Amino acid sequence: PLCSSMTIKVPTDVECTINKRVVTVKGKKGTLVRDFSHAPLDITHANDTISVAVWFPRGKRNALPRTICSHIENMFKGVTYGFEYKMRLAYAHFPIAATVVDNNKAIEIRNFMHQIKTRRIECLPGVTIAMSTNVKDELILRGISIEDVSHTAARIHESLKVPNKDLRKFLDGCYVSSRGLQEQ
Amino acid sequence: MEPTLINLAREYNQNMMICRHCYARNPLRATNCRRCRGTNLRKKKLS
Amino acid sequence: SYHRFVEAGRLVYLGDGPDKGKLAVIVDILSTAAVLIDGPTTGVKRQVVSLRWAMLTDQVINISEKPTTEQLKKEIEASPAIDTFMNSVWGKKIQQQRLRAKATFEDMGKIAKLRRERKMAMKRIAMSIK
Amino acid sequence: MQKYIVYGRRLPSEKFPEPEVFRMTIYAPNEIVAKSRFWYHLKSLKKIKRTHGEILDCQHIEENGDFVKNFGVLLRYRSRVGQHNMYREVRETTSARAMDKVYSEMAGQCRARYHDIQIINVKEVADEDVRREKVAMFTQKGVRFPHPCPYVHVKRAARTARFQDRAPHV
Amino acid sequence: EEIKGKTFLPAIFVGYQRSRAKQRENVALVKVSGIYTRAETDKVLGRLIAIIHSKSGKPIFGKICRPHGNSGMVRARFYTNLPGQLMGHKVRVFYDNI
Amino acid sequence: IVIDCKGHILGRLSAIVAKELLHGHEVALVRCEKAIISGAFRDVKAHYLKKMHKRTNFNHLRGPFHFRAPAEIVRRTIRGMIPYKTVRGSDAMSRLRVYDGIPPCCARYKRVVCPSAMAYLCLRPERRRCEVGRVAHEIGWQHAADVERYEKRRLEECDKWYQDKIQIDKKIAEAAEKDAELQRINAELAKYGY
Amino acid sequence: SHRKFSCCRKGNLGYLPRKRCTRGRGRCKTFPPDVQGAPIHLTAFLGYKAGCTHVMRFIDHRGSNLHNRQAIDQATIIDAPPMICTAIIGYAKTPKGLRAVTTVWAAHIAEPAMRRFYRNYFHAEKTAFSTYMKKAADGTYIKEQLGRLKQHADVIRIVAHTQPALTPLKQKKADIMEIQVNGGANVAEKVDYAYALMEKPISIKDVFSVGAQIDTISITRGRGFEGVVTRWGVTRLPRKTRRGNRKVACIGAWHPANVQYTVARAGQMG
RNA sequence: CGGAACGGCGUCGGCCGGUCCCGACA
RNA sequence: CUUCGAUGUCGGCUCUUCCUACCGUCCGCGCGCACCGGCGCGGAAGCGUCGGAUUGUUCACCCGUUCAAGGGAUCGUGAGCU
RNA sequence: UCUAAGCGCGCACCCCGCCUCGCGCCCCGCCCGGCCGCGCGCCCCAGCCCCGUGCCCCGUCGCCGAGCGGCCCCCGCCCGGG
């Protein structure tokens, strides 16, 4: 009899169709479909509001509905505006040098602590990197969906890792900062 | 040496918590470290 | 869970238990684990059955609060669902099941012979149309 | 299992010319088990053992099975560490089946067999005062939930001998 | 042969009735197909069942006596106890009485 | 009898198959690289890699041989439940034929799926189950891609075949107005019900 | 007790068993990767070994001890008899590894190649290929069979007869070594390269470019049943030893009561 | 999952308690 | 408890396998972690863990080295030796 | 909020390739014959799409032909030199 529901309302601009557990979401920036067949959810849509409606909630089943309605909201927010998870390269004595390579889909970062090897980051499908004139050494990662662009960010901070020496003194590295939704 | 950037970087690095049993970094406000399940043992170190 | 939900008045087929085959209206939801059933028409005396035994049938009959027996009979008679379930294909298989129930050894001999005749004919129709 | 009511008296002596009839209601599978429970309680509460008393009568009562009622049971139990007090609420048509549910839940989850539980009190409470949340949901006017295990409708497994031409659809 | 004109319902001789230690060859277990309940093994109780002895070319018959189990298996004995090579072959409950 | 082992728990199905081989029915399991072994993959792999570690220390050849490919895994599983040493068992194990995918004889045999042993039904959702294929390319079967190349092919051809069969099958019952009609009243609806 | 001081198990175990090689001569077993779209080239060739030299060469190796300094290195000369394509073999990627489809021989098999089929040539029937030669040589059976290989088999190989007469070897019986067209743009292109080469001489200069690195596979030289001291490299036991110094002292511990696969013992050393 | 002293916002329950529709400094 | 109608009995040599409660290397975190060092964990048995003086030595010591962890296998290993 | 779903990464370890052996197996050559069987949609369970069937007769009267699959048959030394 128990059920966990977090009714989320589709914005007027966005359009969503839920077939099985797969949802196709379209708006302005593009179309993103996510497969949600990893969990039990009566993801009935209807009205102007999607419903997640899990059934017979045991301990884990209470969490799934809210997560899959917050996630479905990230799909709606991304298609209207896009998440611009920007990052700022921070350097000390040796300045970090960044180049956008494959027509804004790739980055090459060098001179991290004068390390001869040049690090290479390829952007995941649906994201683009852009160097920014707005701030010194700011890189803007702009993407249609949060999972695709945020995960690009996870690779960049990880690729630039100081091998040894205490991290508190040796803080050199790129780090994600603003997570705001603006640029595609 | 950088200013606002070394503050953000400190948040990523210096700011966190370390449980003695797990010997692992944990969220700032977490009641229990994921690895050392449930322990309250905690601490961080600074410059 | 998009259709056929356990609720008040859903006509159900008790798959397992001393009542096997009988179709009765659900009267009260005792618990999620077990639900009260009572079919005056199909002679299923009211008893609490585990929900596992009940096999939900789409037909749902309108019921008054806690009908007990006297009210249920009039409700069952008034509702067209009891006849309608039999009319649908599961209902007709349910009826085919009723015929297969009274099996006699000698009858099986008559049935197997007829079954062979259908199979041989099926190859013959298959031979006829290429 | 059968909700017997047991009346008993201590054997009459000169000093206590008449004992007082003491009555208890014991839920037990068979009357012979029931009488053992009626005495064990009267041994602990009123210091009268079976040899020193005569069970005046044992009476089986059968409740009405036609309507569902919300039964709250107060049941003392023994865990490996020791004795505890508990209130378990179940919904069942007859007080014997509510007792059955309590003795399969407190024996299934709290691992105490019938012999270790002294039923402090069984009562049928109305919907407004029901305390445990599980009896609270199905107390509603219309409780619509999907079938819990439509999967278990595959009992046809033995009949098909696991040789069905195609996989079944739930 | 004596019985080449009885249609029959199939059955498989699974094994001798045998405890994990002792074995009794005086009885044989036939799992008659089409039977899934012990109560329904009564409809076949007492009927002639024949095995096609590979070596003889001749059928060794035998009769059903009592239900052997809840699943539906039935106990039956034959004119001479089956050799053991015949185990797993096909045994037929003759649909016709004779 | 040919079984589409897709979706059947290697364990549940193997029990049901050993009994029919002992009943002399000769069963062949096809699509046995699609059995789901219950449990997480990072765990159902560990217990198998343990069973590939156990090997005689005087000479690895004399001791247990471990079969990496999925077809010989579902045979080795069903072997434990067959008295393979005894001659009854030796014939039974021989009767079983295991085919990954449906490569030759099984490509046309009628296919029966067991409902009792079916994993989708047998386990509660959230149990976590791994296809024998994911374990197979992890312990060491190198032809998983070399099986995808035959399996993809068969389905593509089968789909055109099914479209063709639809027409011939429709024509089958258009002519079912003959003796098939008489035997049906006489049996199917004679209260025989079959 | 235990091993006390720690050493190593002498002798790579991958090469076990150390036995007389059953295969007649070196066998490819693995062929270079296909890399579709590469220059269309043949992967292998067969030669016969000859005496060693002492060539002197100049090393232009940046950051090296001998950079820009004359040095001498040792090379082994191999006679390369020019081979002739005698047939095209197809292989289909299959669930069981590689299964072959429609091997086609040439219209005329070469005379040294014919000798291979018979144990003795003069005192033999010489009937092999009698039906095939009549069957082909009209250039029709060859074309259709080659078409089957192209349609149903991805991997294509050239059976090649090598000529033993050109070299001093008294073999006199052609040996057949499979070569694989690799880098063909699509399955069709590889077969057409082979057909042009059907019954045609290929010399090593065509197969291997100068200055490339190549792999040498051969049945190695042997010395007969050898003692453990050379067969496995075990240290000689102290001079004063009854029953002889040259032998492993203990072939197993008591509890693993058998001889272990790795334990060193006498074997064919070659 | 031979086996403890200790731990476990792992999961289902219970006991003894305080808050809060004067809705949990506004 | 088992062996007295006898399981050859310390160590060294020699040879193989294992064990992990990891000494160096491999891995990610912690420090009283600037660096270099050092240290504290968790995963990990792949590899290396030597040459010598004295004593039968199991040890123990000392010298030197690419700095040198422990163990088991009938105190592994005598129709292998000494 | 590092995990519950989902997802990125990640050990001189592990597994595999490469490498040593290879039971069997295969395509051609010689030869070109004998023999047995008759049976195909797929995908999905919280859309399960109208379900919860079907087979239930391998002699029981089925075996022609084809089409599909299987099975079987082969194929010396002696003697010299290395």
Side-chain angles (χ1 to χ4, degrees):
Chain A
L2 212 44
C3 90
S4 305
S5 205
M6 220 226 130
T7 359
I8 268 333
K9 173 238 175 228
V10 202
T12 15
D13 305 340
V14 182
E15 42 265 347
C16 107
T17 132
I18 324 211
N19 32 289
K20 320 280 200 187
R21 328 234 180 105
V22 214
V23 201
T24 120
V25 169
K26 200 175 310 247
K28 333 211 129 145
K29 257 75 229 252
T31 142
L32 146 89
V33 193
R34 176 127 161 234
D35 210 351
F36 280 126
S37 50
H38 34 246
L41 245 342
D42 247 40
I43 8 215
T44 135
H45 176 26
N47 327 319
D48 344 289
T49 39
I50 108 117
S51 359
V52 262
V54 83
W55 265 115
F56 294 119
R58 304 297 297 151
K60 318 168 98 232
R61 324 257 269 260
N62 216 89
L64 269 337
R66 170 116 211 224
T67 283
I68 269 107
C69 238
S70 310
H71 268 303
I72 236 236
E73 202 125 71
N74 307 326
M75 320 228 274
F76 299 156
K77 279 339 198 94
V79 297
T80 163
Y81 330 111
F83 288 81
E84 53 128 76
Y85 261 82
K86 78 207 350 168
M87 314 170 302
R88 181 109 17 107
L89 315 141
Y91 48 82
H93 181 270
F94 291 123
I96 272 194
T99 22
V100 132
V101 212
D102 309 333
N103 215 332
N104 283 56
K105 266 103 47 203
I107 13 180
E108 226 190 338
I109 287 118
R110 230 155 337 241
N111 220 53
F112 166 59
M113 295 317 218
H114 239 55
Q115 276 176 346
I116 311 278
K117 196 197 82 229
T118 141
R119 274 102 231 152
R120 223 237 178 221
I121 295 286
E122 184 75 69
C123 288
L124 275 197
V127 355
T128 236
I129 173 69
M131 261 100 55
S132 121
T133 108
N134 321 307
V135 210
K136 160 224 113 285
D137 282 66
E138 185 191 66
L139 296 196
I140 304 193
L141 272 169
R142 5 180 272 125
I144 323 225
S145 17
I146 179 148
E147 191 96 342
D148 299 339
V149 58
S150 73
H151 269 283
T152 326
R155 222 195 340 263
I156 284 123
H157 164 231
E158 258 77 89
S159 57
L160 268 337
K161 170 204 133 179
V162 220
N164 263 339
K165 301 138 254 283
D166 177 14
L167 248 294
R168 109 221 358 195
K169 212 53 130 191
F170 286 76
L171 255 184
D172 262 19
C174 176
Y175 297 94
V176 207
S177 321
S178 144
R179 164 249 173 268
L181 11 113
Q182 167 73 277
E183 287 292 323
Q184 153 239 89
Chain B
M1 339 298 148
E2 61 260 46
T4 355
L5 332 170
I6 228 169
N7 232 341
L8 145 99
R10 277 261 198 248
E11 158 258 314
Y12 261 84
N13 274 294
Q14 194 98 274
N15 156 67
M16 237 125 43
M17 248 155 24
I18 320 289
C19 113
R20 244 122 357 183
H21 182 235
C22 46
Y23 262 119
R25 331 166 121 183
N26 328 300
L28 188 59
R29 12 241 349 251
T31 45
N32 327 293
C33 113
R34 343 139 172 160
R35 331 277 165 200
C36 47
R37 194 187 7 158
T39 63
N40 227 75
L41 313 162
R42 251 124 265 273
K43 93 246 165 24
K44 200 42 228 226
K45 222 47 108 152
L46 259 122
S47 170
Chain C
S1 354
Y2 302 84
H3 251 119
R4 267 225 228 97
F5 0 94
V6 174
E7 59 184 348
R10 211 95 201 201
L11 182 66
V12 285
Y13 146 71
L14 284 328
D16 191 89
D19 295 275
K20 225 119 176 3
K22 341 236 116 275
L23 265 117
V25 173
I26 267 176
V27 240
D28 257 23
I29 28 244
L30 183 121
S31 165
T32 181
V35 164
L36 200 60
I37 55 118
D38 175 47
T41 271
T42 30
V44 202
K45 33 146 16 197
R46 165 195 240 85
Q47 47 199 68
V48 34
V49 296
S50 161
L51 216 24
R52 308 171 59 171
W53 286 359
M55 308 210 22
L56 285 159
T57 256
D58 1 84
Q59 270 321 113
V60 32
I61 110 139
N62 20 75
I63 56 153
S64 212
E65 197 264 332
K66 231 270 110 61
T68 81
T69 148
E70 79 292 324
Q71 251 315 111
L72 205 31
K73 172 72 183 98
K74 287 207 306 287
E75 290 155 25
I76 275 221
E77 137 189 39
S79 118
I82 175 89
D83 176 50
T84 317
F85 170 60
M86 317 290 162
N87 295 354
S88 110
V89 6
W90 195 13
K92 280 308 170 11
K93 210 43 75 243
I94 265 341
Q95 255 100 81
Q96 294 302 307
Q97 299 282 354
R98 301 294 166 86
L99 331 170
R100 294 153 138 196
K102 28 129 256 111
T104 341
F105 188 61
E106 95 101 56
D107 284 356
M108 301 171 203
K110 324 290 131 119
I111 288 151
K113 252 293 204 4
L114 277 145
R115 239 186 235 144
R116 187 51 209 180
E117 240 260 58
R118 161 227 142 140
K119 257 110 51 181
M120 245 352 250
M122 232 41 99
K123 292 163 72 162
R124 197 172 26 199
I125 312 299
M127 278 149 200
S128 89
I129 55 112
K130 17 173 24 141
Chain D
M1 218 205 295
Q2 286 314 304
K3 199 208 129 194
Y4 304 97
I5 300 204
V6 251
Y7 281 79
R9 61 153 209 256
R10 108 145 283 259
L11 282 194
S13 75
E14 22 84 53
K15 158 159 146 115
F16 302 125
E18 37 91 23
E20 153 82 303
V21 188
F22 315 106
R23 34 132 315 125
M24 209 220 132
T25 141
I26 186 61
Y27 291 66
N30 56 81
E31 345 156 85
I32 299 309
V33 175
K35 269 164 275 327
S36 160
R37 291 264 116 171
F38 161 71
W39 275 117
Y40 148 81
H41 293 129
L42 232 78
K43 209 211 356 131
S44 315
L45 281 135
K46 317 295 241 47
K47 220 202 161 156
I48 291 140
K49 2 184 12 142
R50 191 170 93 179
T51 39
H52 296 153
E54 247 250 7
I55 352 105
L56 257 9
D57 203 17
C58 152
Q59 285 110 303
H60 160 249
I61 331 271
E62 22 120 355
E63 212 211 63
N64 34 83
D66 340 282
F67 350 88
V68 183
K69 309 152 148 330
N70 333 293
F71 281 96
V73 184
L74 264 318
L75 55 141
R76 180 154 131 184
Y77 83 92
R78 183 169 287 255
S79 88
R80 253 144 246 136
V81 354
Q83 306 237 283
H84 305 298
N85 292 134
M86 252 202 16
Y87 174 73
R88 181 117 324 131
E89 204 169 5
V90 271
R91 219 162 104 115
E92 248 293 343
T93 180
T94 277
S95 205
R97 225 157 351 225
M99 188 250 336
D100 255 355
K101 253 215 237 153
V102 134
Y103 270 109
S104 82
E105 259 148 78
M106 115 99 25
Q109 193 214 100
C110 292
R111 250 49 90 119
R113 298 112 197 103
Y114 172 76
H115 265 271
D116 302 346
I117 295 119
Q118 294 107 54
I119 301 269
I120 317 167
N121 209 15
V122 174
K123 26 112 143 206
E124 173 212 349
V125 246
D127 311 315
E128 288 328 290
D129 8 88
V130 155
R131 290 138 44 88
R132 283 319 158 249
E133 213 50 47
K134 30 136 342 261
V135 234
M137 277 117 31
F138 346 113
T139 241
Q140 256 318 295
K141 188 230 209 116
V143 205
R144 170 245 153 274
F145 46 97
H147 196 285
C149 32
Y151 105 96
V152 95
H153 311 146
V154 284
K155 7 213 177 32
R156 229 216 179 187
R159 153 88 208 211
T160 184
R162 314 115 0 220
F163 288 123
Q164 257 195 221
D165 51 34
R166 45 111 256 261
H169 288 196
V170 325
Chain E
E1 332 219 36
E2 19 199 340
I3 321 274
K4 50 156 178 296
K6 263 33 105 252
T7 30
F8 91 69
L9 152 83
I12 325 112
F13 164 47
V14 19
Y16 300 129
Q17 186 237 287
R18 156 240 341 108
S19 106
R20 221 15 236 154
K22 353 190 63 65
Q23 174 161 86
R24 334 276 231 143
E25 294 92 10
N26 337 86
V27 273
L29 255 28
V30 159
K31 187 206 244 157
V32 31
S33 105
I35 295 303
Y36 318 109
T37 136
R38 179 174 238 250
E40 235 306 285
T41 224
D42 251 55
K43 220 31 239 203
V44 313
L45 260 215
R47 214 116 320 117
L48 207 51
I49 276 229
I51 182 112
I52 331 142
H53 187 8
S54 34
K55 306 241 159 169
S56 284
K58 260 351 233 139
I60 313 182
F61 304 85
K63 244 208 306 272
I64 312 204
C65 305
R66 59 143 27 177
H68 159 80
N70 260 340
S71 283
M73 307 236 311
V74 87
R75 226 169 248 163
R77 318 168 84 233
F78 291 76
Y79 199 36
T80 122
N81 311 297
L82 260 14
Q85 283 96 298
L86 254 40
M87 224 183 297
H89 293 6
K90 163 92 94 59
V91 105
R92 321 120 77 99
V93 36
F94 292 127
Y95 264 148
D96 305 290
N97 324 301
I98 357 114
Chain F
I1 6 202
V2 135
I3 297 184
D4 229 343
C5 206
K6 183 212 93 40
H8 298 74
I9 330 218
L10 149 120
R12 291 310 179 104
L13 153 126
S14 45
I16 95 112
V17 176
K19 200 52 159 159
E20 246 31 71
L21 257 8
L22 246 14
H23 272 56
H25 273 8
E26 202 255 70
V27 188
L29 305 181
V30 321
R31 265 225 293 235
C32 350
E33 22 95 32
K34 254 280 220 14
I36 355 222
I37 165 120
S38 281
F41 148 74
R42 14 121 4 169
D43 312 327
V44 297
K45 206 222 355 175
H47 110 97
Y48 271 144
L49 260 187
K50 204 109 13 108
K51 293 235 230 88
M52 250 123 228
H53 161 65
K54 307 168 168 219
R55 228 92 137 262
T56 272
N57 70 103
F58 57 88
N59 159 47
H60 292 233
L61 222 11
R62 194 135 346 257
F65 308 111
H66 298 299
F67 285 109
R68 319 280 204 274
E72 22 237 62
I73 282 170
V74 315
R75 162 173 310 265
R76 175 67 67 113
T77 294
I78 207 233
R79 175 182 101 182
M81 327 180 173
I82 279 290
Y84 63 109
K85 291 255 211 271
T86 87
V87 209
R88 189 170 62 127
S90 133
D91 318 324
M93 230 206 350
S94 290
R95 280 187 272 233
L96 166 95
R97 307 276 141 88
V98 283
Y99 288 97
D100 284 331
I102 2 234
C105 330
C106 24
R108 274 215 198 175
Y109 265 13
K110 203 191 298 292
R111 224 132 324 153
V112 261
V113 144
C114 338
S116 130
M118 200 137 30
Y120 102 80
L121 272 165
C122 209
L123 44 96
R124 205 228 358 247
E126 105 222 309
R127 124 103 319 211
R128 286 317 151 97
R129 342 107 194 94
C130 181
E131 305 266 36
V132 148
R134 228 270 241 226
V135 217
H137 151 75
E138 278 303 295
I139 60 215
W141 183 39
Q142 6 256 346
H143 307 307
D146 251 6
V147 124
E148 215 286 326
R149 71 114 214 112
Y150 171 74
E151 268 302 275
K152 204 242 169 147
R153 279 216 220 140
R154 198 225 9 143
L155 231 150
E156 296 338 284
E157 302 164 40
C158 234
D159 286 342
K160 332 278 157 279
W161 165 80
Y162 166 63
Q163 169 60 234
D164 296 308
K165 217 54 170 161
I166 284 170
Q167 162 82 57
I168 96 118
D169 271 341
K170 281 173 337 222
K171 296 227 350 245
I172 274 269
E174 313 285 335
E177 253 67 38
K178 323 191 168 349
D179 201 30
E181 263 186 352
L182 170 62
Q183 315 306 305
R184 237 65 223 120
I185 315 149
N186 276 8
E188 222 288 291
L189 320 141
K191 226 256 183 226
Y192 297 148
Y194 280 111
Chain G
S1 58
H2 74 299
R3 198 39 193 99
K4 225 197 159 46
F5 296 110
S6 302
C7 205
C8 51
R9 190 242 6 253
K10 309 118 195 141
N12 202 307
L13 237 272
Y15 292 112
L16 200 131
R18 329 271 280 202
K19 49 144 53 88
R20 240 172 273 144
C21 162
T22 57
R23 309 122 181 217
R25 40 107 241 250
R27 241 59 133 186
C28 218
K29 184 179 315 219
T30 78
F31 259 106
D34 245 318
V35 203
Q36 316 101 276
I40 163 141
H41 43 223
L42 274 194
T43 53
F45 206 76
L46 190 130
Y48 298 96
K49 197 207 163 126
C52 296
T53 12
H54 234 194
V55 39
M56 160 189 269
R57 30 124 32 171
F58 213 50
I59 338 246
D60 195 57
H61 243 188
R62 298 110 281 166
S64 103
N65 170 53
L66 251 247
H67 190 17
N68 312 125
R69 172 62 56 168
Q70 209 101 182
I72 80 164
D73 274 73
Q74 11 281 170
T76 183
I77 321 271
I78 276 109
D79 171 89
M83 243 120 126
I84 271 233
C85 157
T86 11
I88 302 116
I89 318 112
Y91 292 95
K93 275 314 180 40
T94 21
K96 218 276 295 120
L98 277 180
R99 283 293 196 89
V101 253
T102 68
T103 76
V104 194
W105 268 74
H108 54 284
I109 137 148
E111 193 245 77
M114 195 58 96
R115 299 172 130 267
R116 163 99 268 119
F117 294 90
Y118 327 112
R119 204 255 172 106
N120 26 62
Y121 190 62
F122 176 85
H123 272 321
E125 21 115 302
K126 285 161 300 262
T127 57
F129 280 89
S130 58
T131 336
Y132 196 78
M133 245 129 161
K134 297 187 308 275
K135 256 150 42 209
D138 340 289
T140 143
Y141 180 55
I142 309 272
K143 301 291 192 356
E144 66 220 15
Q145 257 223 111
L146 256 228
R148 272 170 232 153
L149 206 144
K150 176 185 316 270
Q151 148 251 341
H152 56 52
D154 25 80
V155 170
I156 291 116
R157 297 241 271 265
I158 291 195
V159 128
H161 113 271
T162 97
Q163 313 178 316
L166 177 127
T167 217
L169 252 347
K170 39 194 30 209
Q171 193 180 342
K172 225 208 221 189
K173 234 197 249 121
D175 237 342
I176 295 172
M177 170 89 227
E178 285 194 39
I179 324 286
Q180 184 169 313
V181 207
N182 125 63
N186 91 103
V187 43
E189 126 135 311
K190 327 190 224 306
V191 214
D192 311 322
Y193 173 72
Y195 196 49
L197 248 71
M198 182 257 332
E199 275 317 293
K200 283 302 148 229
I202 343 146
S203 174
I204 191 135
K205 6 242 222 11
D206 323 323
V207 171
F208 296 131
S209 327
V210 44
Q213 303 170 17
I214 57 111
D215 299 337
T216 40
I217 318 192
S218 118
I219 352 164
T220 47
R221 185 214 30 213
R223 299 146 43 99
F225 214 48
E226 243 317 292
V228 227
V229 61
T230 358
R231 208 256 192 141
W232 272 122
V234 323
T235 70
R236 123 212 338 254
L237 267 276
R239 244 11 112 121
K240 179 203 353 184
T241 18
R242 194 56 155 103
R243 286 95 164 110
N245 62 302
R246 344 189 55 92
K247 66 212 337 230
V248 151
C250 143
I251 43 184
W254 193 327
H255 236 0
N258 265 312
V259 184
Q260 287 121 270
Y261 65 128
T262 54
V263 183
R265 3 240 349 234
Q268 177 106 166
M269 215 238 146

